[PDB]
Amino acid sequence: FFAPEPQIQPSFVGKEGGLLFSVSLTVPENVSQVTVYPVYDEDYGLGRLVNTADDSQSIIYQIVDDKGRKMLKDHGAEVTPNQQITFRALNYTSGIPPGIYNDQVMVGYYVNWQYKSLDVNVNIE
């Protein structure tokens, strides 16, 4: 098992359901399932992006696969080794100042599950 670093792609957002960022990766050998999930609320698959320059500005989000299914710990997308797959962070905030927003998410690979943390630092404008 070896997992290349997943790549974060910014989006060019304030609508409920709007794309905030994406995570793309190549499925390793011997892996049949991959999840990318936030850990703000791990049980319900919710993340919290925070503005690095302003504590008081956050965006709640969920991460979905290419069929729009929310990803959770130990429950991701079924995949084939060597395919490229993309996950999308979608705004779940009801009711956004431009800046740089941060969160940490997790990537799980079903080989047993192997986990790797992923830092997210993205422009949202």
Side-chain angles (χ1 to χ4, degrees), residues 63-68 70-80:
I63 301 177
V64 302
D65 68 8
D66 53 37
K67 287 315 190 79
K70 182 166 65 179
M71 302 284 86
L72 299 170
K73 185 182 180 68
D74 298 332
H75 305 268
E78 197 78 4
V79 293
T80 294

Side-chain angles (χ1 to χ4, degrees), residues 7 30 51 103 118:
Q7 297 302 120
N30 302 320
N51 188 320
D103 196 15
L118 178 62

Side-chain angles (χ1 to χ4, degrees), residues 23-68 70-80:
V23 177
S24 290
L25 63 82
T26 294
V27 179
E29 308 258 40
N30 302 320
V31 176
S32 58
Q33 196 183 155
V34 173
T35 179
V36 178
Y37 65 91
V39 295
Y40 169 66
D41 187 315
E42 187 185 278
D43 298 328
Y44 288 83
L46 301 184
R48 173 193 181 192
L49 285 159
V50 182
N51 188 320
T52 60
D54 186 347
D55 264 11
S56 76
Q57 296 290 347
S58 292
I59 313 165
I60 304 300
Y61 69 96
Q62 59 178 320
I63 301 177
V64 302
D65 68 8
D66 53 37
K67 287 315 190 79
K70 182 166 65 179
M71 302 284 86
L72 299 170
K73 185 182 180 68
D74 298 332
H75 305 268
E78 197 78 4
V79 293
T80 294

Side-chain angles (χ1 to χ4, degrees), residues 82-122:
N82 296 315
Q83 70 164 115
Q84 262 270 329
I85 57 182
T86 296
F87 300 91
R88 287 171 293 142
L90 305 182
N91 202 341
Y92 187 62
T93 310
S94 57
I96 306 178
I100 291 159
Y101 286 77
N102 165 90
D103 196 15
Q104 161 162 120
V105 301
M106 295 291 324
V107 188
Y109 303 86
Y110 189 67
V111 178
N112 56 36
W113 288 98
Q114 306 285 295
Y115 312 90
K116 171 81 208 171
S117 65
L118 178 62
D119 290 328
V120 179
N121 295 284
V122 292

